[PDB]
Design an enzyme around this catalytic site. Structure first.
Site, PDB file in Angstrom:
ATOM      1  CB  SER A 178      -0.986   0.045   1.180  1.00  0.00           C
ATOM      2  OG  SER A 178      -1.672  -1.220   1.385  1.00  0.00           O
ATOM      3  CD  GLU A 206      -4.376  -2.842  -2.428  1.00  0.00           C
ATOM      4  OE1 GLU A 206      -3.455  -2.139  -1.938  1.00  0.00           O
ATOM      5  OE2 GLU A 206      -4.835  -3.881  -1.883  1.00  0.00           O
TER       6      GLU A 206
END
Ligand SMILES: *C(=O)/C=C\N[C@@H](C(=O)O)[C@](C)(Cn1ccnn1)[SH](=O)=O
Length: 269
Positions: free
Chosen positions: A42, A140
């Site tokens: 992230s 993601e």
């Protein structure tokens, strides 16, 4: 000797560790595997928010983006709450940074480069910033899931710090837009146990974490001395020995940050 301190962290946590702190006026650069590749995870969401901020006027943060439960394929604690009413671009940046929201990040990628070209477009903002090394190849959650040794979705402690430096301590964003990024990183909820833990309470900390498979744990931060002297801290790790489902070690990052804090704060008059 600091290399040997880091080596011991590695032996103990059964893990590979990457650290970079750029040299300032008063300090040398701290490096340990700084040019070895580590999964972004992230941590990309920080320069991603800069990229959306840079390409558009502040007006663009009021643009409502709708999406569906179909779009939620990763941990999205904020995007789940707003699935039906939609989230604005600003809210998305808020969630991407402060909650590491995966759906939020995937929408910003689409806003940045359209459907199919968000990764290309994000990698290109880094290229615009003189990072030729980093690369994003997936959205993601798959970006968190490449094997050890795959260059895809990697950066290095070195590269990502130098990017963060430009974003937070340089002119890659104007003051109105830079402040918003900094406010979002400053209000991060996912980072208490990493770089933050390794630094005294009178040092100020903004950060973006990462976590992923093979025991990946990252944190990138900008830290301020009590007298406002700034430093960039990049700490990255993985644990491939445990397989794809291996435990990441936040403690490993807090220890590293403690070594660094130790160096940067002891004054030797
Ligand atoms: C965030 O910085 C990077 C990754 N997040 C992962 C995590 O929070 O551990 C996941 C996206 C979590 N997850 C599982 C299923 N859907 N999301 S990653 O482990 O896939």
């Amino acid at each position: 000797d600091l290399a040997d301190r880091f080596a011991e962290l590695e032996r103990r946590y059964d893990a590979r560790l990457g650290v970079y702190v750029p040299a300032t006026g008063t300090t040398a650069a701290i490096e340990y595997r700084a040019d070895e590749r580590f999964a972004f995870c992230s941590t990309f969401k920080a320069p991603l928010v800069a990229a959306v901020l840079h390409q558009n006027p502040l007006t663009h943060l009021d643009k409502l983006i709708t999406y569906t439960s179909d779009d939620i394929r990763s941990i999205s604690p904020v995007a789940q709450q707003h699935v039906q009413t939609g989230m604005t671009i600003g809210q998305l940046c808020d969630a991407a940074i402060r909650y590491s929201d995966g759906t939020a990040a995937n929408l910003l990628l689409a806003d940045l480069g359209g459907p199919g070209g968000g990764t290309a477009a994000f990698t290109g903002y880094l290229r615009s910033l003189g990072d030729t090394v980093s690369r994003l190849d997936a959205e993601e959650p798959e970006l968190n899931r490449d094997p050890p040794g795959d260059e895809r979705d990697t950066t290095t402690p070195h590269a990502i710090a130098l990017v963060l430096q430009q974003l937070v301590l340089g002119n890659a964003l104007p003051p109105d837009k830079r402040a918003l990024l900094t406010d979002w990183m400053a209000r991060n909820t996912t980072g208490a146990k990493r770089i933050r833990a390794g630094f005294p309470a009178d040092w100020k900390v903004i950060d973006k974490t990462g976590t992923g498979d093979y025991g990946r744990a990252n944190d990138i931060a900008v830290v301020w001395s009590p007298t406002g002297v700034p430093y960039v801290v990049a700490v990255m790790s993985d644990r491939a020995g445990g397989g794809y489902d291996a435990e990441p070690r936040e403690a490993l990052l807090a220890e590293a940050a403690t070594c660094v804090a130790g160096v940067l704060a002891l004054e030797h008059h």
